[PDB]
Amino acid sequence: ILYSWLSSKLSKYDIKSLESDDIEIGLLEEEVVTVLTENIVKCKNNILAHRILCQYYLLTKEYEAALPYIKNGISLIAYNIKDLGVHLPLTKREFSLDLATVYTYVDAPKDHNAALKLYDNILSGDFSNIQAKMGKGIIFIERKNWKDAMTLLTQVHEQSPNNLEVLSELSWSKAHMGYMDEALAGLDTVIKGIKGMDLRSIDFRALNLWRQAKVYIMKHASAKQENVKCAFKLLIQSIKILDTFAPGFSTLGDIYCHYYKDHLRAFKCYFKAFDLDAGDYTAAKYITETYASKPNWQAASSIASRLIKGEKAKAELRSNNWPFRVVGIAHLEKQEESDSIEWFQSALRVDPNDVESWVGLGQAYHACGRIEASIKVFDKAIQLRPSHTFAQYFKAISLCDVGEYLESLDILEKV
Amino acid sequence: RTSYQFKRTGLEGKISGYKEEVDLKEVANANASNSLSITRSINHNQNSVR
Amino acid sequence: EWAHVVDLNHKIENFDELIPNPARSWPFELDTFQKEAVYHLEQGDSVFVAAHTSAGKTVVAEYAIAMAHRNMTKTIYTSPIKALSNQKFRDFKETFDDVNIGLITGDVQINPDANCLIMTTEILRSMLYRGADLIRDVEFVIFDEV
Residues that bind ATP, according to the entry (chain C)? Predict the structure, then answer.
């Protein structure tokens, strides 16, 4: 396990230094894995072996398989502290990295602040740890809280100043203020690392090819259209090195209509995103805008399968009532008026001051049978929107269908 | 047998453009024959409930 | 057509924006499982309360109208006893903030243009056979004491 890890073939260790057409026969990594299941599981209070077991599976594209032996890792000596009695100053600092990073990146939106007081424990004398930048990075950067997120990005200084990626974070995420060229420079300084051509190694490069591309795209604005046209090389490279990458066309799809105003390949951008997934803000709204304005709402109904169904998509879509009318109005013209109402309820909840959400719902109410409700609804669209013309005709018809010709004489005067 | 219907313009089309349709099902809208379809003409001979 | 058993030991504690509209919120704190009932109401599925009287059974009755009044449907409270009809009518007058309530008797209906009607089970039955006005307009019918 430990000796065999010292003689590994991935991480920064070596067999030769520690001593002091034709198949090979060297000390491979596959000899190690057999000991990590059978032998280690039987013995109790075996902490270093547990730690090393965790660390290999942890950083190598897995935040899941280490989970069983983190809880155990805690159990091992924390229980044994009574009947043996030994110091534990460094126990709360490695398991700060080991425990929290499993929950941070695996569950992408959920358990970010899993440590809570465990990062507060290490961050006292030494101004943090690799974990208080790895785990607390997404706390400061991704969720957006620009108090310490702007300034404190080289709080990785005490442990490791010359690590490749962590020093480049200074201006990557903080690229909306002004430091764009600087960010680009930094990212260039972080590129020189692996540069692989495989599934395991080249993911980092693939994800850089989105990372830097965004920066490149940004640097133009905060006038000239030099690095707007030249951005293609970084975006096109993104969809190339790995295998499949959806955010390439989707991120720069709406960007194509800014300065050049090239809306010809904006059609091809989200047609290309249909290959990957395109479960996002732009693609749906666009796909509706072309097909529904034809008019042709049958193709707009296909967007409902991935518009609200995304689950994580609902968090950033509840400000406006744009995703509810796309799915709702698709059902209206196809003639199934029972399904119409529920969508329009949510839309109403979202947007109180609106015509199409109410008048569209009132059309369904009209067609279903609830004509008494349609009077209430349509007259509220006269109350909300200063004086809507189509609401008076719809209401007039609804007055007629019931039987009352009381205000039908007065309402049809203005129309 | 025909019916006047008017739809929408396009994206966020608050009543502008339109296209018409035709419908056909069962018979004339009246409770004398049957008309179990809920969309039916309310006559001037009905109380709140009874 | 399915009837899942809710364990009553779980909660979605986002009540401010779980209901996206400003529906209703009281100074007195409701029970956790009865907030879940309200949550289930807004989805579209039906409900079934197996509780005790004098222990906040009106939580469902509160959001029966409050959902229907915003979303523009109607509601029928159906009690077998006539006294109870009067009682819960009074209750509806009291707790709610400006709601059009009604009650059907033999002679004639109190409040002809009511949003929330009240009636006897016999009188309810006399909608489905006669062909009443308010079986179009009503979506969520309340049933008292099953």
Answer: 51-58
CB A375 within 8 A of CB B31: no
Point out the residue among B31, B46, B48 whose CB comes nearest to the CB of C109: B48
Chain A residue with minimal CA distance to C139?
Answer: A370
Per DSSP, the residues of A208-252 read HHHHHHHHHHHHTT---SSTTTTTHHHHHHHHHHSS--THHHHHT
Residue A50: name the closest of A80, A26, A16, A28 by CA: A80
Which residues, other chains included, contact B50 with Cβ-Cβ below 8 Å and sequence gap of 6+? C126, C130, C132
Q: How far is A252 from chain B (nearest CA, A)?
A: 22
- Residue C127: its chain B contacts at CB < 8 A? 49
Cross-chain residue pair C133–B31, CB shorter than 8 Å: no
List chain C residues with CB under 8 Å of A402. Answer: none
* Distance in angstroms (rounded) separating the CA atoms of residues C39 and C10: 13
CA distance A238 to A242: 8
Quote the tokens at residue C48: 């079934």
What are the structure tokens assigned to A128, written together? 């943090």
N- to C-terminal Cα separation, chain A: 86
Cβ(A97)–Cβ(A134) below 8 Å = yes
Report the candidate in A52, A285, A40 with the shortest Cα–Cα distance to residue A270.
Answer: A285
Residue with tokens 């400061």: A140
What single string gives the DSSP state of each residue in A125-151?
Answer: TSS--THHHHHHHHHHTTTT-TTTTTT
**Short-list C17, B11, C68, C38, CA closest to A319:** C17
Closest CA to A342 of C65, C43, C141: C43
Q: Which residue in C has a C-alpha nearest to residue A320's C-alpha?
A: C20
- Residue in chain C closest to A339 (alpha carbons) equals C44
* Dihedral angle sign, alpha carbons of residues A307, A310, A313, A317: positive
Rounded to whole angstroms, the Cα distance separating A389 from A382 reads: 9
CA-based nearest residue to C11, from C37, C32, C42: C32
Query: Does residue A114 contact residue A104 with C-beta atoms inside 8 Å?
Result: yes
CA–CA separation, B15 vs A355, rounded Å? 9
Report the neighbours of C using a cutoff of 3 or more CB pairs below 8 angstroms.
A, B
Q: Annotate A94-117 with DSSP letters as a single string.
A: HHHHHHHHHHHHHSSSS-SS--TT
Is A167:A190 a contact under the CB 8 Å cutoff? yes
Kindly give, in sequence order, each residue whose CB lies less than 8 Å from that of residue A278, ignoring residues fewer than 6 positions away: A246, A250, A270, A284, A306
* Elucidation method: cryo-EM
Assess A386–B contact: CB distance below 8 Å, yes or no: no
Q: Resolution in angstroms for this experimental structure? A: 3.8
- Gap between the Cα atoms of A298 and A56, Å rounded: 51
Q: What CA–CA distances, in Å, run from C130 to A229, A372, C25, C118, C135?
A: 73, 19, 39, 17, 11
Long-range CB contacts (< 8 A, 24+ apart) of A160-167? A160/A130, A164/A190, A164/A192, A164/A193, A165/A190, A166/A133
The total number of residues shown for chain A amounts to: 415
Integer Cα distance of A70 and A76 in angstroms: 10
